[PDB]
Design a binder for this molecule. Structure first.
Ligand code: GTP
Ligand code: MG
Lengths: 49, 171, 196, 229, 454, 102
RNA sequence: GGCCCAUUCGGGUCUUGUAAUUGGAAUGAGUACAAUGUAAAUACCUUAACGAGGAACAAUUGGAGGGCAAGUCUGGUGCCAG
């Protein structure tokens, strides 16, 4: 019963990287770049009312 | 302990998922037990707030409650007010257990390594080897959690796997 | 308590069948002692007949009918432990089965085969008797294997059958306290009528 | 199943030792098993207190009296031969049996309240006390509730303490049981609540009976030594 | 007023608990227990001994014969002495050497007898914490302790060992490791007239031993920082002090229980107490102890406090705030690096960064009226405790000891009314635990002996 | 190496005896080893090895300490008189069996 | 390549997988020396020896959904639907 909740929490916090953007811990080494792309059309910010 | 009111709502399921995964718990009964007695604690502190200043019950049971909460260690020394007992919650209580504390002090590499160290008796607070993971260490036993001297991660004689490998490599 | 009364009064109801067993002079109830070769049986049949009739019946053979009650008399016979054929016959005609189990060794396929042959040919009453309780110094493992044998026996007979525990043999046969209340268990059994 | 006077701890057992018959009553005495075993602890159990009773160390009232349940009541001087143990046991202020240690010239005697004076048979005056020492021939002025002093080698009365207004009295009985101070008041009624009244630290007042009180000396000079704190 | 209501209700509570001086005042259970007290044996070790040597103002102070015998060992660390009922002394250094002295030639400097020097040869061939059973010290011997009977000296340090040496030859008879990785010993004290050692190890642990049986009695736990000092008398009590938790504990070692004593001086209330009409402040770390008698002791702090504590009061009875001075502030040619004295003076912030000397040695003569304090102010101080036992006061100074005083203890001579003592004090130019000490102002590594009289 | 500590030593002249509580200390050993403990007790006190006795042993949790009840006699004969018969069967010389019937 | 959202088209995101190989440590259930305990024995407590790779020293219970045949059955507007 313990290892199951260890491995369904690892699954959950791997799914959490998909929905939000998770603070991983800051800049590791040299700033290499965005490594995955930059979208200039998408704005993922909450507008008011 | 006692089960909650609506035990199957999705906020409660993701709550218990985060709690059991972040603290290495085995089932729901750990959360439900520590939350049941926390419910008793702050249900009492609510009544101690609903009575007035200079009430004898409020004065004596309030400073008694916050001093034994500080000595359990869920409440810091400077917040000696009674509304912080209401601000208290469940992971403030199960950060105090020995599995969490062994991992935070760094004798283990995760909470699961801490749980198996505790159940394999390599961990002793003070004098006695503690061997159950949900122990609720206090503010004075916080700094004597160390490896047991009867254990190979302390300084003792190495266990059966190490000595059998040493003997077979000596053969 | 009314729902309890309904749900308990329901399980008195059973299929109404005929009896065909007389009430004036019923036959002696056939008690079959069934065991793998090497446990109880002889010693057990000797001890039961010695307690019942005050007569040392050394060197048994064949069926042995004794009077054990004011109206219940019963016939003792022993299957040869290697023969599945005699095992099958006494499964088909026995009324009570004293099921010998070597409690130190555990369950065994001869008693399991008798249990299945009886279950398919019209399961009689079965009182399980576990002998060889000389496991070790460990009374802990005595109690553990005791509970495990009781549960495994309860999955084969109805849940709440009687497993009986015999201690070590003393002077040729079993302790007479244990055989006394074993005969107390045999004396109240309340047989139900079979079909074949 | 115990009384209050014995100073008996509750974590002891189930059956409490009934004292046997003897000089004093059951309700105003402690036996030797509850004395030696579990009060000043010269034993650990009944077997070894019977062993030292068979060895005969005890010398209560100058005689040996080897018995387990021998009812030592008020001021029977328990004498033990090894380490010259002389014990006069009196009442404390809260009802128990305070066993004071005394010396040999004090344990050479005891005192006793006189109960009745009789013209019993053949012209012989007669006196009894709480241990029942029927000793011959006191003076005619022995009233009730006076105090004789027993010889404890023979049995004779050696000294006599007269009961009157202005005497140092000891109260053993009722809700005043075990008090000392003997002077605020005197009041002899005609059948009850009749006594001499006893002071306190602030010289408070108290009521008792005649038979529940008995004299031990004078205002400052009792020849009994008393314990202190 | 809520604290007034708390005090009032507590008073009513205690009055009610009393509810639930005459001529007769005797209690049966008390006198029965006193009969058992008359029956028992062993009125020897457990004297609750009070202060029976009242001689503080009596002896001379100002004209001691002070001989500072300099020795060639870098950073002497401890001093152990011995008197039977010839006297030997022991020193030990950071250069891994134990050195035996004779001291009984009282009117002159001590005499070297025997070296015992460990080194790199004694590093174990395992790096494994329970086969630490070598015969010498390979790192930083911190403490010595002579037996009260004098068969052995026992020493240990940062190599987490206890090596017990014989006295007559300085030979290692037995090695007892402390069986874990951080188990460095920091203080050792025999209980007086005995064979029982109390070592204080940095695992927040206190180990106890019987030396003539080569056995460990009891490990006892409970401090919160490293147990920097230990002290004991003839009773089986002990008094330890951990460094930064600012508490001193005393241990009933058979019962394995303790009494804790925290500090608690605050510059807010202290500067208000002076503001009713001043460079004094809070506390860093309680460092050294010595049990004066079986009811009192004294603690040396990190802000120069010397405090006097009873067995019956949590907070201390008496303080003495500055006991060795405040350190000389860093010079204007060594603070800033500007050119002008105005900016280099502005970089001192006035008085805000003057730090006091910390008392690094304290010794109470057992059951006596006088104790000795030492730091790197250059002058030992001698204080006597008043006869009502609620204060002490500076008698005089012993100004011939340039350096840190890593150890103070005294050696007795003379009879019941006429006495003379030699105060040994180990002097180094570096603290006995780490270095940390700059401005070495004419220090030397020696033994400051003083001969005090009358 | 076992270690011994006597505490609260009183004298019973009525039973010709000296009694005390026994803190027995065995770090990294199993337990008290009562015959070896009687040896160690009989040599820390005077000789009387068949007159020294211990009975009440309780080891605390995790081992190390055990509290027992020690009583030491002079005069082995009067020790045989005063000790109970089951402890004499346990340690010393007496052996009388009970008649096994009914 | 995994994951997430959404009735739809689609959109959002990111070190994620594999009956892949492999390594030495840990000890607990069990098996057991004892001693302690106790009238005696049990049990608790203390405790040497052995005890893991399918760590086979082999935990369940219930639910959701598929997919397959030279297979079988039914219907009927070929090859389909069930
Ligand atoms: N230790 C012990 N031995 C028993 C016990 N019951 C029977 N035996 C032994 O079992 C041995 C074998 O003989 P029986 O027991 O008569 O054999 P059985 O059970 O009739 O089986 P068969 O040999 O096939 O006829 C005897 O000699 C008995 O000593 C028991 O409870 N304990
Ligand atoms: Mg047969």
């Amino acid at each position: 019963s313990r290892v199951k909740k260890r491995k369904k929490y690892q699954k959950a916090q791997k799914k959490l990287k998909s929905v939000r953007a998770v603070y991983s811990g800051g800049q590791s080494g040299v700033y290499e770049g965005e490594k995955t792309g930059i979208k200039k059309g998408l704005t993922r910010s909450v507008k008011f009312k | 302990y006692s089960t909650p009111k609506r035990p199957y709502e999705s906020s409660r399921l993701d709550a218990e998922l985060k709690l059991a995964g972040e603290f290495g718990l085995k089932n729901k009964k750990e959360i439900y037990r520590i939350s049941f007695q926390l419910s008793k604690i702050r249900r009492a502190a609510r009544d101690l707030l609903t009575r007035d200043e200079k009430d004898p019950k409020r004065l004596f049971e309030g400073n008694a409650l916050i001093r034994r909460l500080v000595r359990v260690g869920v409440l810091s020394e400077d917040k000696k007010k009674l509304d912080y007992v209401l601000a208290l919650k469940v992971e403030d209580f199960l950060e105090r257990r020995l599995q969490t504390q062994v991992y935070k002090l760094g004798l283990a590499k995760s909470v699961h390594h801490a749980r198996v160290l505790i159940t394999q008796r390599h961990i002793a607070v003070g004098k006695q080897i503690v061997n159950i993971p949900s122990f609720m260490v206090r503010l004075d036993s916080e700094k004597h959690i160390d490896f047991a001297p009867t254990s190979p991660f302390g300084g003792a004689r190495p266990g059966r796997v190490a000595r059998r490998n040493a003997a077979r490599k000596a053969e | 308590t009314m729902q309890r009364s309904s749900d308990v009064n329901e399980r008195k109801l059973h299929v109404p069948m005929v009896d065909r067993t007389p009430e004036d002079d019923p036959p002696p109830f056939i008690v079959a002692v069934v065991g793998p070769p090497g446990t109880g049986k002889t010693t057990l049949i000797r001890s039961l007949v010695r307690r019942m009739t005050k007569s040392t019946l050394n060197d048994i053979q064949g069926p042995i009918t004794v009077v054990s009650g004011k109206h219940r008399r019963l016939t003792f016979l022993e299957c040869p432990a290697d023969d599945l054929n005699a095992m099958i016959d006494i499964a088909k005609i026995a009324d009570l089965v004293l099921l010998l189990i070597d409690g130190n060794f555990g369950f065994e396929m001869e008693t399991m085969e008798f249990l299945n042959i009886a279950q398919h040919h019209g399961m009689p009453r079965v009182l399980g008797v576990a002998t060889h309780l000389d496991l070790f110094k460990s009374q802990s493992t005595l109690r553990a294997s005791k509970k495990r044998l009781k549960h495994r026996f309860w999955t084969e007979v109805y849940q709440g059958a009687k497993l009986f525990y015999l201690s070590g043999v003393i002077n040729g046969r079993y302790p007479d306290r244990e055989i006394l209340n074993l005969s107390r268990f045999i004396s109240v059994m309340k047989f139900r009528p079979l079909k074949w | 199943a115990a009384p209050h006077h014995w100073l008996l701890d509750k974590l002891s057992g189930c059956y409490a030792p009934r004292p046997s018959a003897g000089p004093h009553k059951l309700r105003e005495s402690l036996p030797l098993i509850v004395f030696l075993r579990n009060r000043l602890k010269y034993a650990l159990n009944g077997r070894e207190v019977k062993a030292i009773l068979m060895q005969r160390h005890v010398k209560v009232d100058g005689k040996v009296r080897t018995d387990t349940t021998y009812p030592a009541g008020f001021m029977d001087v328990i004498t033990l031969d090894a380490t010259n143990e002389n014990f006069r046991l009196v009442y404390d202020v809260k009802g128990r049996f305070a066993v004071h240690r005394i010396t040999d010239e004090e344990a050479s005697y005891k005192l006793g309240k006189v109960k009745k004076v009789q013209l019993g048979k053949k012209g012989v005056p007669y006196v009894v006390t709480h241990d029942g020492r029927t000793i011959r021939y006191p003076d005619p002025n022995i009233k009730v509730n006076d105090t004789v002093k027993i010889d404890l080698a023979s049995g004779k009365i050696t000294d006599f303490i007269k009961f009157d207004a202005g005497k140092l009295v000891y109260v053993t009985g009722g809700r005043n049981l075990g008090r000392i101070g003997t002077i605020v008041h005197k009041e002899r009624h005609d059948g009850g609540f009749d006594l001499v009244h006893i002071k306190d630290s602030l010289d408070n007042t108290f009521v008792t009976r005649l038979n529940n009180v008995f004299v031990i000396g004078e205002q400052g000079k009792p020849y009994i030594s008393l314990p202190k704190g | 007023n809520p604290a007034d209501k708390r005090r009032r209700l507590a008073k009513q509570y205690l009055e009610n608990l009393k509810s639930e001086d005459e001529y007769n005042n005797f209690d049966a259970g008390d006198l029965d227990k006193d009969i058992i007290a008359s029956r028992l044996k062993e009125d020897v070790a457990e004297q609750q001994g009070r202060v029976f040597r009242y001689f503080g103002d009596k002896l001379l102070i100002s004209e001691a014969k002070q001989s500072f015998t300099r020795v060639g060992e870098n950073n002497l660390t401890c001093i152990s002495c011995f008197q039977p009922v010839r006297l030997f002394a022991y020193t030990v250094s950071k250069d891994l050497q134990l050195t035996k002295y004779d001291i009984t030639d009282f009117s002159k400097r001590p005499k070297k007898l025997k070296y015992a020097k460990g080194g790199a040869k004694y590093i174990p061939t395992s790096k494994h914490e329970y086969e630490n059973t070598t015969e010498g010290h390979y790192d930083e011997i911190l403490t010595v302790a002579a037996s009260p009977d004098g068969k052995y000296v026992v020493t240990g340090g940062r190599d987490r060992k206890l090596i017990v040496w014989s006295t007559e030859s300085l030979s290692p008879v037995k090695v007892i490791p402390t069986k874990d990785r951080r188990g460095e010993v920091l203080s050792l004290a025999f209980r007086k007239n005995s064979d029982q050692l109390y070592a204080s190890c940095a695992d927040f642990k206190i180990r106890t031993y019987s030396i003539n049986q080569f056995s460990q009695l009891e490990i006892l736990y409970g401090h919160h920082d490293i147990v920097e000092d230990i002290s004991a008398l003839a009773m089986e009590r002990c008094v330890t002090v951990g460094a930064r938790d600012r508490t001193a504990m005393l241990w009933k070692i058979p019962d394995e229980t303790r009494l804790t004593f925290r500090g608690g001086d605050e510059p807010q209330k202290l500067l208000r107490r002076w503001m009713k009409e001043p460079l004094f402040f809070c506390e860093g770390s309680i460092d050294v102890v010595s049990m004066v008698d079986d009811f009192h002791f004294i603690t040396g702090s990190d802000n120069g406090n010397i405090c006097l504590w009873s067995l019956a009061k949590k907070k201390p009875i008496f303080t003495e705030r500055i006991a060795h001075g405040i350190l000389p502030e860093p010079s204007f040619n060594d603070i800033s690096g500007e050119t002008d004295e105005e900016l280099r003076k502005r970089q001192l912030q006035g008085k805000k960064l003057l730090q006091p000397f910390w008392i690094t040695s304290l010794y109470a003569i057992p059951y006596s009226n006088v104790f000795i304090s030492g730091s790197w102010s250059g002058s030992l101080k001698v204080w006597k405790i008043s006869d009502n036992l609620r204060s002490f006061e500076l008698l005089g100074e012993l100004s011939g000891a340039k350096g840190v005083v890593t150890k103070i203890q005294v050696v007795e001579s003379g009879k019941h009314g006429k006495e003379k003592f030699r105060i040994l004090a180990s002097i180094a130019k570096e603290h006995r635990l780490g270095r940390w000490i700059a401005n070495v102002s004419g220090a030397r590594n020696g033994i400051y002996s003083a001969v005090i009289d009358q | 190496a076992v270690t011994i500590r006597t505490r609260k030593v009183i004298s019973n002249p009525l039973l010709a005896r000296k009694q005390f509580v026994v803190d027995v200390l065995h770090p990294n050993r199993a337990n008290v080893s009562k015959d070896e403990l009687r040896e160690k007790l009989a040599e820390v006190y005077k000789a009387e090895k068949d007159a020294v006795s211990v009975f009440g042993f309780r080891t605390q949790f995790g081992g190390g300490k055990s509290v027992g009840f020690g009583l030491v006699y002079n005069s082995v004969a009067e020790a045989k008189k005063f000790e109970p018969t089951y402890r004499l069967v346990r340690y010393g010389l007496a052996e009388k069996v009970e008649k096994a019937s009914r």
